[PDB]
Structure formats: structure tokens, C-alpha cells
Amino acid sequence: AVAVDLGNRKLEISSGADGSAVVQSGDTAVMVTAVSKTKPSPSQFMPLVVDYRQSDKEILTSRIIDRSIRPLFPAGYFYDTQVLCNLLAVDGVNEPDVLAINGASVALSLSDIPWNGPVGAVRIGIIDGEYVVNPTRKEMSSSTLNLVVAGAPKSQIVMLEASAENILQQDFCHAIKVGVKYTQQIIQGIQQLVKETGVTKRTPQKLFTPSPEIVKYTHKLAMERLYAVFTDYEHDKVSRDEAVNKIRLDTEEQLKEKFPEADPYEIIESFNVVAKEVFRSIVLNEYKRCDGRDLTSLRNVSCEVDMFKTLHGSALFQRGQTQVLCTVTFDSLESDKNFMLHYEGHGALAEKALYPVIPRDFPFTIRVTSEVLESNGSSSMASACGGSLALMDSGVPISSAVAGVAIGLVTKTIEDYRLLTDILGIEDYNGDMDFKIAGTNKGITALQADIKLPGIPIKIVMEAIQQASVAKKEILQIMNKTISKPRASRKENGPVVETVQVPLFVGPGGYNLKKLQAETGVTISQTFSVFAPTPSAMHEARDFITEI
Amino acid sequence: AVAVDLGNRKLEISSGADGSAVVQSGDTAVMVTAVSKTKPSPSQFMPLVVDYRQSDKEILTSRIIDRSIRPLFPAGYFYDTQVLCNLLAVDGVNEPDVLAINGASVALSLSDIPWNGPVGAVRIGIIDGEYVVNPTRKEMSSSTLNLVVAGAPKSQIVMLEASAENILQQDFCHAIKVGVKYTQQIIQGIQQLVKETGVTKRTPQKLFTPSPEIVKYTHKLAMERLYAVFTDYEHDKVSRDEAVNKIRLDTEEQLKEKFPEADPYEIIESFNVVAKEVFRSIVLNEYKRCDGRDLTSLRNVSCEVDMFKTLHGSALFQRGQTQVLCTVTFDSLESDKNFMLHYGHGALAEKALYPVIPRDFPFTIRVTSEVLESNGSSSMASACGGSLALMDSGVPISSAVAGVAIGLVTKTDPEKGEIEDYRLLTDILGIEDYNGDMDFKIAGTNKGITALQADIKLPGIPIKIVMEAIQQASVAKKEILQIMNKTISKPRASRKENGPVVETVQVPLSKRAKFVGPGGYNLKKLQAETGVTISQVETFSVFAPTPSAMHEARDFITEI
Structure with missing residues (x-):
């Protein structure tokens, strides 16, 4: 097991499924496992799935982990990959979502899977002006910032997710710099563990990237026509997408006649590569975009x-x-x-x-x-x-x-x-x-x-x-x-609430009030409080109570 | 790995967490892990959770797995136990939910966790009158019954969940019999795998069950007072619960004096054991229930x-x-x-x-x-x-x-197990x-x-x-x-007069761009004004919560 010092508390990392890992902070520990099949997927992309266990929290966490590890797989790695996180303990103090992201990093780093990591990930909060590293569940309840940073080697930023209580840009940017610094400490822990564990990566069968020969011939066939489309500023979103697709249909039938030994999917991506390079070369070389806008210009x-x-x-x-x-x-x-x-x-x-x-x-x-x-x-x-x-x-x-x-x-x-x-x-x-x-x-x-x-x-x-x-x-x-200020009054059809004190009306099991909301459409609860979508419905509500 | 041949298919069970297992049928394979802490849980129950991988179906499947394994843990096994099911492959043909149930059985059976299994589980469907075991996805679409049964050894049923297309009783009964037969075939497979793998189960710290002494003393204190309560037929739900609690507080106080070394949790369960036994002995010996009813009697x-x-x-x-x-x-x-x-x-x-x-x-x-x-x-x-x-x-x-x-x-009978x-x-x-x-x-x-x-x-x-x-x-x-x-014995010939209405509306292509508006703004503006809902089919369907709302919607449509 390895240790990293992220300010106050620590973070321990161990091994165990092509690769497993356990990340513990306090008495909260998460186990993450990464697998990836050796047979290429028949879907012509990388199918990566992150499964997180703790429910909207799970889905948002699963995608936060996904964004932290996705950009580090090699291109054309079209192999079914699954990253499962299993919570082993929760102390109610240390949040496991940050540990899971790290757990996903260690698993892949210790695994067979080609993954150019490792990745470090921390939370940053601001409690009483203090920049807090991985704030506890209690500290997060009085923090002005909830920022999660996934750091790559050499202080590169992989993922940034934040919610802030309107903090100033200067603190927000300082908090980002703090977090990245700690992500570099975690990567030192991982890399130290991969040499103690001994990791050997497979040689995948095929990285489904198009060959330079087909890419070069696709460039000659489509460059000037693609350049024409991406310099015509009258194009709308649909007319420009269909314009490149017309160039897309004419060129690959020409490509199939030149490279009959080529995979049908290799022909599609080859045009995608060329269309992507032409698009990006215009913004780089000529400082203009595909609709005439410059780099800092808003749309209307x-x-x-x-x-x-x-x-x-x-x-x-x-x-x-x-x-x-x-x-x-x-x-x-x-x-x-x-x-x-x-x-x-x-x-x-x-x-x-x-x-x-x-x-x-x-x-x-x-x-x-x-x-x-x-x-x-x-x-x-x-x-x-x-x-x-x-x-x-x-x-x-x-x-x-x-x-x-x-x-x-x-x-x-x-x-x-x-x-x-x-x-x-x-x-x-x-x-x-x-x-x-x-x-x-x-x-x-x-x-x-x-x-x-x-x-x-x-x-x-x-x-x-x-x-x-x-x-x-x-x-x-x-x-x-x-509009620059909130309307001083709500609309006159706006709902209304009123309080009713009852003298010891609810009936058997509440049949009284289920009937009230069913007929008038109001909502009652408790010193009863009644909500009415309209003042008119509120009138039928006070009609209902008087008969009781 | 052991193979169990059902009717129209086979499933193979493997090993791998105090115990793991992989259950494969076709090219769908589920891995299930079972772990159980050795330190007693602070709570007074058995902490058992089942996590199933795929949502509503994950909740339903997890519960069905739970009912299939929960009754076989020894009483007083107050130890945190986790059963994690993980789907490795889904071929779209063989459903993994039943495979996971078997996995939870194999995993626990191969583990060191006290569990008196194993359990077999299958799905039964009736496809064109023929009883198919573990029907495929396609077979299930044309099945008049979705019966899931989990069986304990000696052809005992532990879990029964079914939905049926109003099938006949004798048909429903026949499917249960068929299912139970196939759960026994699975139990042999798991038992063979247990002897192949080799299983030595743990000795837990303590099984938190009340001692015969404190239960005997509890019976001396509460049996006759509880018997009079459970034969008092005027009790309703709350008054009977109050009378039973009045006897609990007096008894649990005398138990603490006679047994000061007893855990308070042992005192609570002692009374519950004695109140349960008295309640059941009245049904068994006198064929009368605690509200005076008989065994087949409905409430009013x-x-x-x-x-x-x-x-x-x-x-x-x-x-x-x-x-x-x-x-x-x-x-x-x-x-x-x-x-x-x-x-x-x-x-x-x-x-x-x-x-x-x-x-x-x-x-x-x-x-x-x-x-x-x-x-x-x-x-x-x-x-x-x-x-x-x-x-x-x-x-x-x-x-x-x-x-x-x-x-x-x-x-x-304690001398038997039946x-x-x-x-x-x-x-x-x-x-x-x-x-x-x-x-x-x-x-x-x-x-x-x-x-x-x-x-x-x-x-x-x-x-x-x-x-x-x-x-x-x-x-x-x-x-x-x-x-x-x-x-009421018949559906009303008509829906109520203020019921919703749906009508069709044609809009020619000339007025079509103006009707929908840019991005559909005008259509959604009509939905807010009239409370109407408009979808396209140059034909649009209009749903209104009121014939009046439809009337107002048709006016705005005629004005285009």
C-alpha cells in the first residue's frame, strides 16, 4: 500500500478483472476493477462503461469518472471496456466519489489495458476562506465551492466540474491551481505503486486508425472542396453538414475504387480525419471560423x-x-x-x-x-x-x-x-x-x-x-x-398559500382531504397549510372546509 | 465448472469476496460475489443487501434474489452480508435475472458464510401451450405466464413471483410443479460443485438468539396474559397492539431483574418469541384467529x-x-x-x-x-x-x-426437519x-x-x-x-362527459411553416394557452383534457 498527503488526511492505494485497486481515506474505502476484451468491438468505437455504486448521484459520479479516464486511451482502441466501482465502506465523513475516480485510475494503471495515465483527482472547497483539499461531508456543507479536478502527468487538466456560490474568478482560478498541484502528488503515488507491483501492457490486435495512404489520398480528393465549404459563411448548421456529406459521398466511391482492400469503416473515418484536419487548419492558419466569426465573437x-x-x-x-x-x-x-x-x-x-x-x-x-x-x-x-x-x-x-x-x-x-x-x-x-x-x-x-x-x-x-x-x-x-430586475410582484393568477387552524375534518384515513385536492385541485398538509394553484381554486378550497 | 441441463437449454456454474460464482446460459454470463463481515453488526437484524447490475428492473430483480436467499440464513446471524451481481455479457436472448439468482446461491454455497442451501431457480413460461423452462427473450414475448420459482432442497419453495395472462388455475399449478422439479436439478449441480471445490464454513462469533432459560422465564410471565389478549375478539389493530405492549413492558422489566447480564436486545426478542408462539398455538389448537375469524373467512x-x-x-x-x-x-x-x-x-x-x-x-x-x-x-x-x-x-x-x-x-417436528x-x-x-x-x-x-x-x-x-x-x-x-x-359489474358504456378528447387536424404545407413556427414555438405556445398537446403524424393529432380545451385549440388552429 502507498500513501499520499493531501493536506490534512491521507489517501491509501493498493491492488486487488484485468486490474483492481482499493482507495481508502479515513474509514471510507472503494474498490474499482477494470476489464477490457481482446476481441475488437463490432461497433467501430471504444465502448467504455463506468459503473459506480453508492439515484442521480450515481449517474453524475459515473460520468465524472468517465470524463477523467476517457481521453487517455489510445485512438482506435475499439475494445469493450468496463470500469466497476464497489463501495466497501462509508464513514459518513469522507466522500467516496473522489476516491472512485482515483480508484479508476489505479485499476487501469495496474491493469493490462493500454491507458496513458495515471490520473489524480481531488475535490477543492473553500471553508472560511480556506482552500480545503477533499473536504469532508461536514466541510462541504459550509463551503462556497465544490470543484473536482482530474490531473494528468505534467500538470495537464483532464476533467473540471464545479459548482460555486458566486465566488470571484480569482479564487476560482486559484482553487483550480491548488487542485492540480495535489493531482500531481497522487500520480506520484500511482507511479510509485506500478513499479512495486510490476505492470505489463498487452499488444492489442489492431488499433483501428486509418492508414496514412488512404488519409493522404482522401486529402487530395476532398481538401479543396472541404475548404470551400468551411470558407462559405452563408451555410447554416444543416446546409453545411449536408454539404460535407455530398463531398463525403462522391469521394469514397472513388476511394473504394482505389483501395478495394480497405475496410468499409476505414473509408468513413479516413474522410472524417481529412474533414477534421481541414476544419481545424482554417481556424489555426487564418484565425477565422467556419461562419466568418473570429475567436472571441459571440453569436447573435x-x-x-x-x-x-x-x-x-x-x-x-x-x-x-x-x-x-x-x-x-x-x-x-x-x-x-x-x-x-x-x-x-x-x-x-x-x-x-x-x-x-x-x-x-x-x-x-x-x-x-x-x-x-x-x-x-x-x-x-x-x-x-x-x-x-x-x-x-x-x-x-x-x-x-x-x-x-x-x-x-x-x-x-x-x-x-x-x-x-x-x-x-x-x-x-x-x-x-x-x-x-x-x-x-x-x-x-x-x-x-x-x-x-x-x-x-x-x-x-x-x-x-x-x-x-x-x-x-x-x-x-x-x-x-x-429585463434586469425581478418583477416586484408575481402574476395575479399566481398561486396562494393560507394557514388553517382546526378545532378538534381529516376523516377516516384522510379521505376528507384526498377528496378536497381531487375536486378543487389544491394541496393540503400541516395548523394545516393549503396550497392552491390559482386564487379561484383557493375559493373552492375554503368552500370545502366550511361544509366540514 | 458443472453443467445443469434444463429442458430447452443448459446452464453452467463456475467459481471465481468470501465466495464468488459465474452462472452462464448461452452467451449471457453473470458473476455474483458474496461477502459477510466477521464482526457483529451494531443493528439488531441481519444486514443483507443484494446489488444487481444491468432502474426499476434492478430493484425488482434485487428483491427477487433477496427473497430467494434470505430465509436460509440461520437465525441471529446479525452480520453485514453483501451479494453483488455483475453482468459480464448479455446476448439479448437468455435473460440474466434468473442466472443471477442461481449465482447468489452458488456464491453463498461456495463461501464460508453460514447458509443452508443451495437454492435452484428457474423461469417458467407457457408458449403455445408448452411449458418452457427459462424461456428466451423471444419466447417470453409470446408467453402467457412469467413464473419465477426458487427451490430449496427436498422440493421446498422459498420464492414465488409470477405474472400471468389470466391463465387457468390447473395450468398455473402445473407450471409451479414443473419449475420446482428443475430447481432440484440445479441443486444437484451446485452440491457437486461444492464437493469439487471443497467448502469449509465459518463459526460465527455468536448467533443472537435468546437462550432457552430466558425464553422459558418469558413464557412463565406472559403466556397466559398474551393468550387472553389473542382470544379477546373485540380487539382491533391498535387496541390489540396496545394490550400486547402493556404486557411487554411489565415482562421486559422483570426479565432485566432476573437476567441483569442479558443484553436488552435479548430481552426484546425473548418476548417476541413467546408472543409469536402463543399467537400461533391458538391458530393450531383451536382453529380460530385473534379476531374470532375462521381459517377461510374474509373480513367485511x-x-x-x-x-x-x-x-x-x-x-x-x-x-x-x-x-x-x-x-x-x-x-x-x-x-x-x-x-x-x-x-x-x-x-x-x-x-x-x-x-x-x-x-x-x-x-x-x-x-x-x-x-x-x-x-x-x-x-x-x-x-x-x-x-x-x-x-x-x-x-x-x-x-x-x-x-x-x-x-x-x-x-x-424438531426430531425431523419437516x-x-x-x-x-x-x-x-x-x-x-x-x-x-x-x-x-x-x-x-x-x-x-x-x-x-x-x-x-x-x-x-x-x-x-x-x-x-x-x-x-x-x-x-x-x-x-x-x-x-x-x-359495479360492467365498464361504463361511455367515459364521463368531461373526459379528454383526441381529434385529427390537417394543415396544408403552405400554412404548415406558420402553424409550427420556428423550431415549434407556435405549437408550444398553443400548448400553454389551451392546455392542449399537439404532435405530428401534413397531419397533426390534438389531445385535449376537456372538450372546451379542444374547442379553444381548434379556434387557434383555424386562425392558423
């Missing part, structure tokens, strides 16, 4: 408020070809803060972006519903924008307006890179990261970095945050033109 | 329909002190049979009503059963109230559905389930069986008892249906 943002007159609150935020419609519905407090945002994964990120500005003792449950009408790049950040608008339109006294944006990245391998403000879908697809960050015009509230490269330097993460605040200020200015 | 059953004015369908079913209130609410289809019941207890009531629900209904059927009073088998009452409410809402169901729970009290005498209890109380051996919940129509869930606390019961419990329940089910049909 417009938004309306109070379009649906019957609902409790409505907004529609439109940024380029990403258009969301958000509604607000107040329900009873009887189903921390009672606030929910629902997407129609994405919802959780938007909900975390608005969570800090939501008031505490609001008389009702606040439910935002973001319906995406058109998708073309990070509609979850659009949901936080539209959610802020619909919250103000409804009368919810939010502390400040929130906005989000996604920053992309196009690197040359890192000899050079381009940071893209407000990426299209195609820029996320052909890019290297999906840097979704939101907050107020004073601070950060949520961050989710979906980095595809085998890690990126701290400098790029810092500049991505700075570039995102510039875009955030512009978005908030457009938003504040539509 | 009454019910109503159409009590609530606003909902599309409502019903209120009461069985003794068990009262449920059921409602039907029609909703759009885009929100197999498009039928749901919302309450574990809900999936069983849903399975009971499912074969009777008609196909091709215009709206989605949402039944809600709210338990107002619970004193035994609210889940079967929810089935009866769901049948009444659905007939009240005008849903063209094939036949009414009733459900009932059957209890069991046994006396087993059951020496038993009494099957009809429509059991809560105290008859807690102090009893079995919660045999079965439901169906006047002519067949739609669902069954047997919660057998004993380490297996003979087939004969299960067959008698099924037949005894059919007598109770017909009595319940006769009372149910006097309130």
Missing part, C-alpha cells in the same frame, strides 16, 4: 420575456442557432433550496448555474422547465440564461442574473492553439474541449470542462475562463435590456 | 365508485381495516398496453390488472391507489380498487380483477403476517390467475401447501368479486 443573442400569458413565468433565449424556451411553474413547498430545472445531464448543469442566486425561504417550490427548440452548441448554458430571465419574469427575487457560454479549443500538436467563444456543434465535434461555464457578472457559479485532448495546460484553462467572462458580460448586457 | 368487504366528481374515474375499496382509494386519469399517449399504476406494492397491483387492460386505448391509463388505512395486503386491495375505478372510468376491461393474501402457521401441521389463513391481518410464515398475495379474475407474489419467511414450504393456498385464495377471490360486482 436575442431574448424575449413574458410571451406565454397563462404561465407563472416565461422566457426564450436565442444565441445563434441555439434557441431555448424556459418556463417557471410554482408548486407547493410540499413537492437544500426547493428549486428544480428540467431539460426537455444538461439540466443538472443549468440547475447548478442558477442555484446560488435562488432565494431561500420562497413560499413555493420553483420549477424551471427549459425546452430546447433548436440545438447547435451548448443549450444548457442557454438554459441558464433563459432560466435567469424566466425567474425574474415570474417574480422570484434572485440575487443576480446568470449567464453561461461554452468555450472551444483547436490545437496543433501543443505548438499553438485557438480558443473559440460560443462554439457551434461542429466546433465541439471537431474541437478539443467543451468548456461550459456560467455565473453572474461578478462571479462563477458552475463549470463543466469536457476536455477531449489527453489533458490541456493550466494556461489554456485560465484563458478560457477569462475569455468566458468577456462573453458573459456581453450576454448579460443583452439580457438586462430585456 | 365494502366498496364504492364515482365518489369524486372531477376525476375521470374513482373507487374506494375497504377490506376490514385495509382501505384504499383508487382513481383513473386519462392522459395523452405520448406522455405495451400504455397502462400504469402508482402506489414494489405498485408493480404487483399493476401486474394483477395488466392482462385485463384492453389494447388500443385512445388515452394513457394512469391508476393511482392511495392507502388510507393499512392492516394487511394493501397491494391486493389496490388491485380490486383499480378494477372498480377502471370500470367506473369507462375503460373496456375484459373482466374484473380481485386479489387476496393467504397466511400460514406451521408447527415443525412441517408437522399447518393452517392456511385467508385475508391476513398485519399481526398474522408478522407472526406468520407467509404473505401469499395472489390475484386474478373469476376464471384465471393474473399475478402472484409469495413472501415465504420459512426456509421453504412443500408444493402441497402452495397448491392449497392457491385454491383457498380462489374461494376468497370469488367472494370478493361477488361483492365488487354488486357495486
Whole structure:
């Protein structure tokens, strides 16, 4: 067993399924196992599945682990891989989710599987201005920041997930730097254990990457036509996708006549490689994007408020070809803060972006519903924008307006890179990261970095945050033109609550009140409290109680 | 690795965590690990959790595995035990849920964890009249029965879960017999693997069962006072529970004085053992239950329909002190049979009503059963109230559905290992389930069986008892249906006047871009104004919660 010092407490790492590991901190210990078949998958991609045990917590944790280990597998490694985490003990103090990410790193590092790690992962909190490493369950209850960082060798950032109570950018960036430093300590522990254990990696049968010969011939056949498409700024999202597909159909029938010995899938990826390189070479060499935008330019943002007159609150935020419609519905407090945002994964990120500005003792449950009408790049950040608008339109006294944006990245391998403000879908697809960050015009509230490269330097993460605040200020200015303060009053059709003291009406088993809510549509509970969606329904409610 | 040949397929069982196992059938393979701590748990029960890998099906499968292995741990085994099932491969043909049950059996049998197995488990389906063991995914789609049975040695049943397409009783009974036969074939395979692997089981620290001395003294203190309570027929649920607790506090105080060295947990269980034995001895010796009822007697059953004015369908079913209130609410289809019941207890009531629900209904059927009073088998009452409410809402169901729970009290010869005498209890109380051996919940129509869930606390019961419990329940089910049909016996010819409406609307391509609007904004703006739901099929289907809402929706559509 090996030990790492992450500030106060420690972290022990051992072995045990192509590879197993146990990560313990305090009296919480997790066991993780990694397997990968030797027969290639018939699906033409890498099927990696992370199974976490502790239920929305499990799914979000499983994907946090997934994002921390995915970019480190070799390309074309199309082999069924399973990473299962089994919680062995929980002390209620040390959280196992961070241990699981590390457990997933050690398992693969000790395993057969080709995995260019190891990865270190810690949480960072801020308790009374103190930067806390892996805060305990109690410390997290009084922390202004919940940040999880997955670090690669040489201080490269693999995964960034954060929720913050509107902390300043300077602390947020300092907290990121702290966490990465500790991830480098953990990797020292892993690498020390792999030499004590003795690890030998297999030689996989075939890394399904296209041969340079087919890639070079595909380049000659499609470069100028692909360059033509990615320099024509009149293309929309669909006309540009279909334009490259027309070039895609003409070239491979030519490719099949040239390389009849080639796998049919090898012909598809060969065009994908060439289409990806042409797309990225334009942003790198000419500093322009496929729609004429430059690296820091937003798409045209417009938004309306109070379009649906019957609902409790409505907004529609439109940024380029990403258009969301958000509604607000107040329900009873009887189903921390009672606030929910629902997407129609994405919802959780938007909900975390608005969570800090939501008031505490609001008389009702606040439910935002973001319906995406058109998708073309990070509609979850659009949901936080539209959610802020619909919250103000409804009368919810939010502390400040929130906005989000996604920053992309196009690197040359890192000899050079381009940071893209407000990426299209195609820029996320052909890019290297999906840097979704939101907050107020004073601070950060949520961050989710979906980095595809085998890690990126701290400098790029810092500049991505700075570039995102510039875009955030512009978005908030457009938003504040539509509405900048929460409506002082809710709509007159808005729900109403009232308290009723009963003299010793509930009937046998509550049949009395089941009948009340069934007929009038109100909601009763306890000094009884009754919630009514409309003042009219409240009138039939007081009609019902007088007969009793 | 040992192979067990069932009828139409074989499964092979392997080894690998105090014990592991791999159960493979076809190219579907499940690995199950079993671990059990050697330090006693701070709690006063047995901490047993089963984690199944694949969600609702993971919860259901985990419970079915739990009922198949829980009754065979020795009493007083208060040690944290974990059974982890992990799916390695799923060929889409052979279902792994039954393979995991067997895995939990093999794993525990190969482990050092005290467990008096092994257990075999199979699925039984009837495909075109032929009884198929462990039917494939394709075979299950055309099966009139999904019966899962787990068997203990000597052809004892430990777990029985079934849903059936209203099949005949003798057909249902025949499947149980077939299933139990194939569980015994699996038990030989596991026993052979045990002798091949070599198994030496642990000696636990302590089995937290009360000593004969303290139990004998407890019996001296409480037997006659408890006997008078359990023969006092005027007691209801709460007054009998209060009288029993009044005797517990006096007795548990004298036990602490006579046994100061006894754990408080040994004092509580001593009284529970004596109260349980007294309760069961009255059923066995006098054939009378603690409410004066006889072994086959129902509680008073009454019910109503159409009590609530606003909902599309409502019903209120009461069985003794068990009262449920059921409602039907029609909703759009885009929100197999498009039928749901919302309450574990809900999936069983849903399975009971499912074969009777008609196909091709215009709206989605949402039944809600709210338990107002619970004193035994609210889940079967929810089935009866769901049948009444659905007939009240005008849903063209094939036949009414009733459900009932059957209890069991046994006396087993200690010189043997067999059951020496038993009494099957009809429509059991809560105290008859807690102090009893079995919660045999079965439901169906006047002519067949739609669902069954047997919660057998004993380490297996003979087939004969299960067959008698099924037949005894059919007598109770017909009595319940006769009372149910006097309130309502036919689905209403029409749904209620304010019921939802669905109509079709054509929009020519010229007005089509303006109707839907950019990204569908205008369609969703109409959904908020009128409370309507619009989906495309140049044809759009419109669902409205009210004929008025449809009227307003058609106006906005005509204005385009």
C-alpha cells in the first residue's frame, strides 16, 4: 500500500478483472476493477462503461469518472471496456466519489489495458476562506465551492466540474491551481505503486486508425472542396453538414475504387480525419471560423420575456442557432433550496448555474422547465440564461442574473492553439474541449470542462475562463435590456398559500382531504397549510372546509 | 465448472469476496460475489443487501434474489452480508435475472458464510401451450405466464413471483410443479460443485438468539396474559397492539431483574418469541384467529365508485381495516398496453390488472391507489380498487380483477426437519403476517390467475401447501368479486362527459411553416394557452383534457 498527503488526511492505494485497486481515506474505502476484451468491438468505437455504486448521484459520479479516464486511451482502441466501482465502506465523513475516480485510475494503471495515465483527482472547497483539499461531508456543507479536478502527468487538466456560490474568478482560478498541484502528488503515488507491483501492457490486435495512404489520398480528393465549404459563411448548421456529406459521398466511391482492400469503416473515418484536419487548419492558419466569426465573437443573442400569458413565468433565449424556451411553474413547498430545472445531464448543469442566486425561504417550490427548440452548441448554458430571465419574469427575487457560454479549443500538436467563444456543434465535434461555464457578472457559479485532448495546460484553462467572462458580460448586457430586475410582484393568477387552524375534518384515513385536492385541485398538509394553484381554486378550497 | 441441463437449454456454474460464482446460459454470463463481515453488526437484524447490475428492473430483480436467499440464513446471524451481481455479457436472448439468482446461491454455497442451501431457480413460461423452462427473450414475448420459482432442497419453495395472462388455475399449478422439479436439478449441480471445490464454513462469533432459560422465564410471565389478549375478539389493530405492549413492558422489566447480564436486545426478542408462539398455538389448537375469524373467512368487504366528481374515474375499496382509494386519469399517449399504476406494492397491483387492460386505448391509463388505512395486503386491495375505478372510468376491461393474501402457521417436528401441521389463513391481518410464515398475495379474475407474489419467511414450504393456498385464495377471490360486482359489474358504456378528447387536424404545407413556427414555438405556445398537446403524424393529432380545451385549440388552429 502507498500513501499520499493531501493536506490534512491521507489517501491509501493498493491492488486487488484485468486490474483492481482499493482507495481508502479515513474509514471510507472503494474498490474499482477494470476489464477490457481482446476481441475488437463490432461497433467501430471504444465502448467504455463506468459503473459506480453508492439515484442521480450515481449517474453524475459515473460520468465524472468517465470524463477523467476517457481521453487517455489510445485512438482506435475499439475494445469493450468496463470500469466497476464497489463501495466497501462509508464513514459518513469522507466522500467516496473522489476516491472512485482515483480508484479508476489505479485499476487501469495496474491493469493490462493500454491507458496513458495515471490520473489524480481531488475535490477543492473553500471553508472560511480556506482552500480545503477533499473536504469532508461536514466541510462541504459550509463551503462556497465544490470543484473536482482530474490531473494528468505534467500538470495537464483532464476533467473540471464545479459548482460555486458566486465566488470571484480569482479564487476560482486559484482553487483550480491548488487542485492540480495535489493531482500531481497522487500520480506520484500511482507511479510509485506500478513499479512495486510490476505492470505489463498487452499488444492489442489492431488499433483501428486509418492508414496514412488512404488519409493522404482522401486529402487530395476532398481538401479543396472541404475548404470551400468551411470558407462559405452563408451555410447554416444543416446546409453545411449536408454539404460535407455530398463531398463525403462522391469521394469514397472513388476511394473504394482505389483501395478495394480497405475496410468499409476505414473509408468513413479516413474522410472524417481529412474533414477534421481541414476544419481545424482554417481556424489555426487564418484565425477565422467556419461562419466568418473570429475567436472571441459571440453569436447573435436575442431574448424575449413574458410571451406565454397563462404561465407563472416565461422566457426564450436565442444565441445563434441555439434557441431555448424556459418556463417557471410554482408548486407547493410540499413537492437544500426547493428549486428544480428540467431539460426537455444538461439540466443538472443549468440547475447548478442558477442555484446560488435562488432565494431561500420562497413560499413555493420553483420549477424551471427549459425546452430546447433548436440545438447547435451548448443549450444548457442557454438554459441558464433563459432560466435567469424566466425567474425574474415570474417574480422570484434572485440575487443576480446568470449567464453561461461554452468555450472551444483547436490545437496543433501543443505548438499553438485557438480558443473559440460560443462554439457551434461542429466546433465541439471537431474541437478539443467543451468548456461550459456560467455565473453572474461578478462571479462563477458552475463549470463543466469536457476536455477531449489527453489533458490541456493550466494556461489554456485560465484563458478560457477569462475569455468566458468577456462573453458573459456581453450576454448579460443583452439580457438586462430585456429585463434586469425581478418583477416586484408575481402574476395575479399566481398561486396562494393560507394557514388553517382546526378545532378538534381529516376523516377516516384522510379521505376528507384526498377528496378536497381531487375536486378543487389544491394541496393540503400541516395548523394545516393549503396550497392552491390559482386564487379561484383557493375559493373552492375554503368552500370545502366550511361544509366540514 | 458443472453443467445443469434444463429442458430447452443448459446452464453452467463456475467459481471465481468470501465466495464468488459465474452462472452462464448461452452467451449471457453473470458473476455474483458474496461477502459477510466477521464482526457483529451494531443493528439488531441481519444486514443483507443484494446489488444487481444491468432502474426499476434492478430493484425488482434485487428483491427477487433477496427473497430467494434470505430465509436460509440461520437465525441471529446479525452480520453485514453483501451479494453483488455483475453482468459480464448479455446476448439479448437468455435473460440474466434468473442466472443471477442461481449465482447468489452458488456464491453463498461456495463461501464460508453460514447458509443452508443451495437454492435452484428457474423461469417458467407457457408458449403455445408448452411449458418452457427459462424461456428466451423471444419466447417470453409470446408467453402467457412469467413464473419465477426458487427451490430449496427436498422440493421446498422459498420464492414465488409470477405474472400471468389470466391463465387457468390447473395450468398455473402445473407450471409451479414443473419449475420446482428443475430447481432440484440445479441443486444437484451446485452440491457437486461444492464437493469439487471443497467448502469449509465459518463459526460465527455468536448467533443472537435468546437462550432457552430466558425464553422459558418469558413464557412463565406472559403466556397466559398474551393468550387472553389473542382470544379477546373485540380487539382491533391498535387496541390489540396496545394490550400486547402493556404486557411487554411489565415482562421486559422483570426479565432485566432476573437476567441483569442479558443484553436488552435479548430481552426484546425473548418476548417476541413467546408472543409469536402463543399467537400461533391458538391458530393450531383451536382453529380460530385473534379476531374470532375462521381459517377461510374474509373480513367485511365494502366498496364504492364515482365518489369524486372531477376525476375521470374513482373507487374506494375497504377490506376490514385495509382501505384504499383508487382513481383513473386519462392522459395523452405520448406522455405495451400504455397502462400504469402508482402506489414494489405498485408493480404487483399493476401486474394483477395488466392482462385485463384492453389494447388500443385512445388515452394513457394512469391508476393511482392511495392507502388510507393499512392492516394487511394493501397491494391486493389496490388491485380490486383499480378494477372498480377502471370500470367506473369507462375503460373496456375484459373482466374484473380481485386479489387476496393467504397466511400460514406451521408447527415443525424438531426430531425431523419437516412441517408437522399447518393452517392456511385467508385475508391476513398485519399481526398474522408478522407472526406468520407467509404473505401469499395472489390475484386474478373469476376464471384465471393474473399475478402472484409469495413472501415465504420459512426456509421453504412443500408444493402441497402452495397448491392449497392457491385454491383457498380462489374461494376468497370469488367472494370478493361477488361483492365488487354488486357495486359495479360492467365498464361504463361511455367515459364521463368531461373526459379528454383526441381529434385529427390537417394543415396544408403552405400554412404548415406558420402553424409550427420556428423550431415549434407556435405549437408550444398553443400548448400553454389551451392546455392542449399537439404532435405530428401534413397531419397533426390534438389531445385535449376537456372538450372546451379542444374547442379553444381548434379556434387557434383555424386562425392558423
